[PDB]
Amino acid sequence: AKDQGCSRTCESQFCTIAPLLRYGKYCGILYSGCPGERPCDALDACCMVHDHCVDTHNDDYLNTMCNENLLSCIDRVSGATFPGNKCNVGQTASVIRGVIETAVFAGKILHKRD
Ligand SMILES: CCCCCCCC(=O)O
Ligand SMILES: [Ca+2]
Known part of the structure; x- marks a missing residue:
C-alpha cells in the first residue's frame, strides 16, 4: 500500500551511523514519510524531496540530479529543528x-560509460 511502511514520527536515531540513521520522517536509507506528512525541519524537507525524486526516477538512488539537489539543499539548511531531536543538525x-557525495560520483561514473 501507499500509507503503509512509512513514518509519521520525527525520529532521531543513530545520528552518526550512516546505514542506520533515522532523522525526522524522511532522512535515512529505506526510511520515508507517509504521503502528505510534513517534514520535521529543513534537513528533513531536503530528504523528503530526495526520496520522491528517487521514487519518480525508477527508484534510481544514483540519479545525479536527485543527489546533487540534495547536496545543494543540505548546504542551505537553517532554522529551528523539531522538539525532542536527539541529533545535532549540522553533524x-x-x-x-558524505554519503551523497559518494553517490554523485558513483552515478557520474556509471553514466560516463553509457
Ligand atoms: C546517511 C545515509 C543517507 C540517507 C539517504 C539520503 C537522505 C534521504 O533522502 O533519506
Ligand atoms: Ca529516506
Whole structure:
C-alpha cells in the first residue's frame, strides 16, 4: 500500500551511523514519510524531496540530479529543528552529505560509460 511502511514520527536515531540513521520522517536509507506528512525541519524537507525524486526516477538512488539537489539543499539548511531531536543538525547533515557525495560520483561514473 501507499500509507503503509512509512513514518509519521520525527525520529532521531543513530545520528552518526550512516546505514542506520533515522532523522525526522524522511532522512535515512529505506526510511520515508507517509504521503502528505510534513517534514520535521529543513534537513528533513531536503530528504523528503530526495526520496520522491528517487521514487519518480525508477527508484534510481544514483540519479545525479536527485543527489546533487540534495547536496545543494543540505548546504542551505537553517532554522529551528523539531522538539525532542536527539541529533545535532549540522553533524547529521555532514554524515548524509558524505554519503551523497559518494553517490554523485558513483552515478557520474556509471553514466560516463553509457
Ligand atoms: C546517511 C545515509 C543517507 C540517507 C539517504 C539520503 C537522505 C534521504 O533522502 O533519506
Ligand atoms: Ca529516506
